[PDB]
Amino acid sequence: VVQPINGDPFIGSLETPVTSSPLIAWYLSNLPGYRTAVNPLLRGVEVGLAHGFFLVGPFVKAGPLRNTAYAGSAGSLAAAGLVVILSMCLTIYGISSFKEGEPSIAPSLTLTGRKKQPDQLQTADGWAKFTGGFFFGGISGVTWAYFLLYVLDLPYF
Amino acid sequence: KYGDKSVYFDLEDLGNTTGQWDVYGSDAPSPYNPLQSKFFETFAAPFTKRGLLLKFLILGGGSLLTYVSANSTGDVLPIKRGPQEPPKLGPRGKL
Amino acid sequence: TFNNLPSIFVPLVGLVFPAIAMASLFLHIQKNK
Amino acid sequence: SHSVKIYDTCIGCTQCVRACPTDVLEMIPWDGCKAKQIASAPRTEDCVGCKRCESACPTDFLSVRVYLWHETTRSMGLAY
Amino acid sequence: EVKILVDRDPIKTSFEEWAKPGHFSRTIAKGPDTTTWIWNLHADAHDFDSHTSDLEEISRKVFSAHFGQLSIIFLWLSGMYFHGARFSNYEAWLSDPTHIGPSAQVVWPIVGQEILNGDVGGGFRGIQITSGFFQIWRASGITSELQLYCTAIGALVFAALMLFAGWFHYHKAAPKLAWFQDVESMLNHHLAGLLGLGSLSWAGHQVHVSLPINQFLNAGVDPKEIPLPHEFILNRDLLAQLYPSFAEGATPFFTLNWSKYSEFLTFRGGLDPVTGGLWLTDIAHHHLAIAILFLIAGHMYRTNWGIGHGIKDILEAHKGPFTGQGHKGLYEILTTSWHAQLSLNLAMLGSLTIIVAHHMYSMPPYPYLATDYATQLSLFTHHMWIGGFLIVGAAAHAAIFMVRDYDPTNRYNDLLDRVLRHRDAIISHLNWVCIFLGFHSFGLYIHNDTMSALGRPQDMFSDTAIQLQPVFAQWIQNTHALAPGVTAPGETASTSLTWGGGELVAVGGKVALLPIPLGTADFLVHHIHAFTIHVTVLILLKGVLFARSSRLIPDKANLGFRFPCDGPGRGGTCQVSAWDHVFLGLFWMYNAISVVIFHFSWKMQSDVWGSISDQGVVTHITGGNFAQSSITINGWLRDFLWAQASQVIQSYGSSLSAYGLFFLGAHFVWAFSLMFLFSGRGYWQELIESIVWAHNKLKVAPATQPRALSIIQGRAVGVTHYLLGGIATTWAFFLARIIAVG
Amino acid sequence: TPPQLDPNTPSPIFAGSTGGLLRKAQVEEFYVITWNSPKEQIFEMPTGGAAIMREGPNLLKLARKEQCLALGTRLRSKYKITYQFYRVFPNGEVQYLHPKDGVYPEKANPGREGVGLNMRSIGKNVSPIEVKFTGKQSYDL
Amino acid sequence: DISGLTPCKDSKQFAKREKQQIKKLESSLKLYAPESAPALALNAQIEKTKRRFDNYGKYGLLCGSDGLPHLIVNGDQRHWGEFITPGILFLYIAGWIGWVGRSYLIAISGEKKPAMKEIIIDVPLASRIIFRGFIWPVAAYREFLNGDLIAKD
Numbered sequence A: 001v002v003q004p005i006n007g008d009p010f011i012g013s014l015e016t017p018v019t020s021s022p023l024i025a026w027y028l029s030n031l032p033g034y035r036t037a038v039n040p041l042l043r044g045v046e047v048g049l050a051h052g053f054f055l056v057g058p059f060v061k062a063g064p065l066r067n068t069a070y071a072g073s074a075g076s077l078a079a080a081g082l083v084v085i086l087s088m089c090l091t092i093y094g095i096s097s098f099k100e101g102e103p104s105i106a107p108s109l110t111l112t113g114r115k116k117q118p119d120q121l122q123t124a125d126g127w128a129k130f131t132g133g134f135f136f137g138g139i140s141g142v143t144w145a146y147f148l149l150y151v152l153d154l155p156y157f
Numbered sequence B: 001k002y003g004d005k006s007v008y009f010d011l012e013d014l015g016n017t018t019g020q021w022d023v024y025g026s027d028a029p030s031p032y033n034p035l036q037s038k039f040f041e042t043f044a045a046p047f048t049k050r051g052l053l054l055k056f057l058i059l060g061g062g063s064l065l066t067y068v069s070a071n072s073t074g075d076v077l078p079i080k081r082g083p084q085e086p087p088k089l090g091p092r093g094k095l
Numbered sequence C: 001t002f003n004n005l006p007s008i009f010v011p012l013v014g015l016v017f018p019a020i021a022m023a024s025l026f027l028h029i030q031k032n033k
Numbered sequence D: 001s002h003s004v005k006i007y008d009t010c011i012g013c014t015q016c017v018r019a020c021p022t023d024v025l026e027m028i029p030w031d032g033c034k035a036k037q038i039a040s041a042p043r044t045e046d047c048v049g050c051k052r053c054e055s056a057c058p059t060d061f062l063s064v065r066v067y068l069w070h071e072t073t074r075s076m077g078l079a080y
Numbered sequence E: 001e002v003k004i005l006v007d008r009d010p011i012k013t014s015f016e017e018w019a020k021p022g023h024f025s026r027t028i029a030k031g032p033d034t035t036t037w038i039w040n041l042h043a044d045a046h047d048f049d050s051h052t053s054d055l056e057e058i059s060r061k062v063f064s065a066h067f068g069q070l071s072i073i074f075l076w077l078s079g080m081y082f083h084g085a086r087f088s089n090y091e092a093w094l095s096d097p098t099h100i101g102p103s104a105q106v107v108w109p110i111v112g113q114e115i116l117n118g119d120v121g122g123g124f125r126g127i128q129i130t131s132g133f134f135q136i137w138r139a140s141g142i143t144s145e146l147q148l149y150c151t152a153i154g155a156l157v158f159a160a161l162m163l164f165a166g167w168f169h170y171h172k173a174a175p176k177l178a179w180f181q182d183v184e185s186m187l188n189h190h191l192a193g194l195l196g197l198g199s200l201s202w203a204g205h206q207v208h209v210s211l212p213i214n215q216f217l218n219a220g221v222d223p224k225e226i227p228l229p230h231e232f233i234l235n236r237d238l239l240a241q242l243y244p245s246f247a248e249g250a251t252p253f254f255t256l257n258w259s260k261y262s263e264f265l266t267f268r269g270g271l272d273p274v275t276g277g278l279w280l281t282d283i284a285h286h287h288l289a290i291a292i293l294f295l296i297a298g299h300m301y302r303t304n305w306g307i308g309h310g311i312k313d314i315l316e317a318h319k320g321p322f323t324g325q326g327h328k329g330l331y332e333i334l335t336t337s338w339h340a341q342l343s344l345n346l347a348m349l350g351s352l353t354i355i356v357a358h359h360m361y362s363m364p365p366y367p368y369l370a371t372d373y374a375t376q377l378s379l380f381t382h383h384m385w386i387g388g389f390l391i392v393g394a395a396a397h398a399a400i401f402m403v404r405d406y407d408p409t410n411r412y413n414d415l416l417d418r419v420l421r422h423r424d425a426i427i428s429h430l431n432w433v434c435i436f437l438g439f440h441s442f443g444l445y446i447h448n449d450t451m452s453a454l455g456r457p458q459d460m461f462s463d464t465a466i467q468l469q470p471v472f473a474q475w476i477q478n479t480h481a482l483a484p485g486v487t488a489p490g491e492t493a494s495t496s497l498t499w500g501g502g503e504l505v506a507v508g509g510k511v512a513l514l515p516i517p518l519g520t521a522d523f524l525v526h527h528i529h530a531f532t533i534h535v536t537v538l539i540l541l542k543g544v545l546f547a548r549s550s551r552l553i554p555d556k557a558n559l560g561f562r563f564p565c566d567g568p569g570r571g572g573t574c575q576v577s578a579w580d581h582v583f584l585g586l587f588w589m590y591n592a593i594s595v596v597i598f599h600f601s602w603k604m605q606s607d608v609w610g611s612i613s614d615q616g617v618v619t620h621i622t623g624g625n626f627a628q629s630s631i632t633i634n635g636w637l638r639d640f641l642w643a644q645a646s647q648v649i650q651s652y653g654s655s656l657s658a659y660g661l662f663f664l665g666a667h668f669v670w671a672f673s674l675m676f677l678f679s680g681r682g683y684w685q686e687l688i689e690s691i692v693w694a695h696n697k698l699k700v701a702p703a704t705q706p707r708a709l710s711i712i713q714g715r716a717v718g719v720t721h722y723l724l725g726g727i728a729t730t731w732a733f734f735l736a737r738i739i740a741v742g
Numbered sequence F: 001t002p003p004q005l006d007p008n009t010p011s012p013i014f015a016g017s018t019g020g021l022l023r024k025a026q027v028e029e030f031y032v033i034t035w036n037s038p039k040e041q042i043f044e045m046p047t048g049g050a051a052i053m054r055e056g057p058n059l060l061k062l063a064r065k066e067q068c069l070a071l072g073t074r075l076r077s078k079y080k081i082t083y084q085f086y087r088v089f090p091n092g093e094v095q096y097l098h099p100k101d102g103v104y105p106e107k108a109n110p111g112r113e114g115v116g117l118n119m120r121s122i123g124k125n126v127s128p129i130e131v132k133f134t135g136k137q138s139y140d141l
Numbered sequence G: 001d002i003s004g005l006t007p008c009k010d011s012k013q014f015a016k017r018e019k020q021q022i023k024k025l026e027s028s029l030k031l032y033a034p035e036s037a038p039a040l041a042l043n044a045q046i047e048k049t050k051r052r053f054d055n056y057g058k059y060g061l062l063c064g065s066d067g068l069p070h071l072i073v074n075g076d077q078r079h080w081g082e083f084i085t086p087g088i089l090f091l092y093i094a095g096w097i098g099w100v101g102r103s104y105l106i107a108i109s110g111e112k113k114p115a116m117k118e119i120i121i122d123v124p125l126a127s128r129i130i131f132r133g134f135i136w137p138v139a140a141y142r143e144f145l146n147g148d149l150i151a152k153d
Ligand code: CLA
Pocket: A055, A058, A059, A062, A063, A064, A065, E439, E440, E441, E442, E443, E444, E446, E447, E450, E451, E456, E459, E466
């Protein structure tokens, strides 16, 4: 049931039932980290939305004043602050890695071996688009979950 | 020939021998609705410029942080309240 | 507003200036002329 | 990368080369010893710095001599 | 078939090899060129796989060495029984086993050390022991120093017997490899005969000796006017008056009417209220049932006849859902590697020692053990340390198997190859879960410290704060508190009282195991324990898997199991060997077991151990401060280390002055170890060469040239002194505290 | 001597391990070793595990030179076969590496020159004050 | 009375320390029968304590405000017995040892493999050499004057 990676038994990995299952290869390929054909901005928006929609949870329900009246009103600001930290993080990552105009450093071909087009996420402008998408989608998700925490009634976490 | 029986050193196809495969990179087309995509492409383009995003995040995060700390009343955080108690004397009178 | 000045500067030196310095020095660390 | 300089006190025992796990060293012909050979060091750029060459050099102090220097990915023993 | 397979006189008994030192190898049987020769002599002293490269001579050597170890253990037992005979207050302890400190050591009055002979009680001035041997002897129904004296002579007889047996099985008539390599017979005998008949004969002792004498002592009887055990055997009216089930005889047994034997083989769960131990009827039934179990288990493997199993036949035919095609070749490596077997056996023996500690604190099997808090603390602490050490030895010997006794050409296994192949996934996920565990346990402690220091106790991780309750362990306690009513109706009370209920078996003014509660602090410290265990497993399994090759040194198996490094290259390879990994796993086993015994001592001193009043309210030693102080490291520093280490500093004067002294000296040796771990051989060799100049200038130059310790030997001396000093500090602390408070 | 001109020869039978070419092959140089095994047999490969090298020519691609030369010494000492490995940069230009003259480096083949060789005892090196404020060190005169 | 210290036979704190230790021993003596063996050992310790304090009284020990015998190691004759008369008795014995183990090392210095006598000590040779260091100071003195004490490299 376990198989060497792509048949090649001298690359540092293995085709297991965890990393090579069709359910996983469908899930881990159709999520915005690996949408190599679409432009990096839309998938970055998806990533930011998914990461800001939930980051408000820990800050609002475990924060320093979660037991007060400004529980969500301050936890959501804290999550927006972490989003403004992490967009800065991605920004400096893209600045240090890809300078201004180089071609993509991504894996060129796929597992089978067909000449797939290089992922534009790993370019300077591409990762910059990803940073902008992450920032916008993260503030979007933080504010949307702030909207939902007081609008929609849940028994909470 | 990389696809031969136990040959993994095709020298002209050095991406298959080095392990340059995209383990999960799908070249499948845009899944989102094109109008939603256009909305995000127009509304997030201002954040695309990196040199103008780093400066913006620095001078916006620092501004919001030095602002929300300043106008934070004595109900959010207690350091801005004060003692709110009679100050007790130290040892040996006060010294 | 002089008891409010610690609230201005302690974040600006402790959170903001460290972010500035860490970002700038990380760029200086990875630069290539 | 590193700097594996050898000295003329070498006796041509060929143990520094038989210990070298990166082929930094190689015996050449020479006329300064009973064995008529000495251990050169062309592939210093492949030197990891393990000093097995000088943990096998049977001289009073040493003939082969590893001076650690600028560390590259070949000299930092990196398979990644 | 399984023959005897021995040979006569393989090695000549003589003192010629006593004379020439280091005879057992090639590079040591020449003489000392340096002083490293001595260290390499003692280091390779029992490295029999290095002396002779055949399993026959190795196996003879380890067999006779096990005989020497058994002679030593019998000699030590003879010593303990004898010191309990002539240098003890065992009679006075039997008369009053609640206010008389168990003492079986007296010091000589020479330099003022006579004050170590304390007022333990019973007209006896001596050292209060903590081995619980008095409790064993009351569980055996001894009641006389003559019996301890004669079993001491018997243990000396057995020590001489084992020494003669080692001499005979090395020098006069030694087995050959066909005798050791057969393991179906070894398992069959060690199951049916050693552990089966051993438990059977102990159950016979208990049924015939321990139960009557302990029932007499519990009823209240001076141990002098108590009938001897042979009177219980011979005089049937006596033992029949104790248990009328004996009046019928073994026709209850042979007609399978065992229901009438339920007067002395009860399943009476829980502890004996009169004495705080377990019910010796329950223990006799236990050893009997265990005897039946191991006796039917020791007839499983095929030895010489047609019936049975082949361990090869089992392992080579064990297909399954997850890599069952493997398991082939394990009979080869385990019957051709003493290091594989030593690793496996040390792992399971140390884990059993830990199980032993955990089951002796909670189900105290000996009478008046739970109320001798020094005995309980010392036993748990001891067996915890022994288990951790034995597991770390399992690591060392797994590594020594991986380096030396591993040949994929001849002795190939599918499972071990599959483990070595994805070993980086193993160590990566284990490193990750170690980081995760370190954070979400110790960082919880740091959060608690910060919040309590910032004046935010509402934000701590506690029961009066953010609660991290052990729901699963609490649920297990709820079940086992209710288990004997529905799931195990044969038990009148639960297996232990740590679960719950209105059960508090006090024997005097002492508790003996009320139900241990599990709060937020217990969650925190149990995750600290899982953490320290996982980091120890990380270090040790990492040394095991990377003993042979890595991305750094792909020829490590050619460098050996126990080598310092491969030089400063590759950045540095300082502690790359598997020996260095067990050397670090020793420090982490120390951290693990030290926090384990700290959890134990504080939890018992706060929630269990204490006094019981005439109104019925328990006053603990520390006072229940584990749920509020053991959430912060400042509380461990304050309410545990600073608070409980008051009796070890006030120890000076009273008998416990030695524990005071052994505190500081232990504190020293630990620090003395830091001279070795931090430093390196080069500085000390250069200092030594300056001192050698100073000696050459006085014609006092030695011929054994002074060399600084080997790098590996510096690390060994360091970890040795470190473990000694830390463990002796904790031993002094524990014993002084618990002998001065309970 | 002319190099041996690495062909597309087969590889050993190996079930795969976590010791292969991660990123030092994608963007930097990786290595490849070729050995002629007279018979098919099992051998402990340096990336952890145990592979079965085939009869005739075999080829194994490794991540660094120490893996190649460790495996080569184990082959030459245990199986007594003649190994020779290369270095292949990610653009090509396979570099012949190990023998460099056809004969192993322990043999004093003529032609190879003296490089990294001081014609002095080791303690006749000048002090660092002599070479201070100069790009040279005390072991390059 | 040097260094502001009263003698110990006159110091009230010294006698108070004696009485305190004696009462501490007697409070442990009450728990045992007066004819029993622990009681007799405690009484022997009591007489040992009493004569210890008496002997520190009579031997000129000086006691401080804490009431403990202090040692005056400066050179005053009254207190030579505290440091110098033992100290010489050390430097003799110590210099015995080093003069023996050195001499032994010179006697096994001229062997073929002299290291197998470091780990396997020639008991006859060592017993011949041991008493050479009885009157070691004159041997060391003369060897210093003859130059045989310091190797000439
Ligand atoms: C590591 C242990 C630990 C833990 C658990 C906590 C927990 C907490 N701390 Mg404490 N703290 C710690 C260590 C820790 N601390 C240490 C070490 C220090 C000092 C060095 C402090 C100092 C400190 C201060 C000074 C304060 C806190 C506060 C807090 C609270 C709010 C944290 C916050 O902003 O939420 C943000 C949390 C997140 C962003 C976490 C997201 C993680 C998600 C849930 C992981 C999900 C993974 C998912 C399962 C992956 C698989 C699925 C995927 C594939 C989809 C929270 C109760 C605050 C407080 O008092 O509130 C009570 C506060 O003011 N902490």
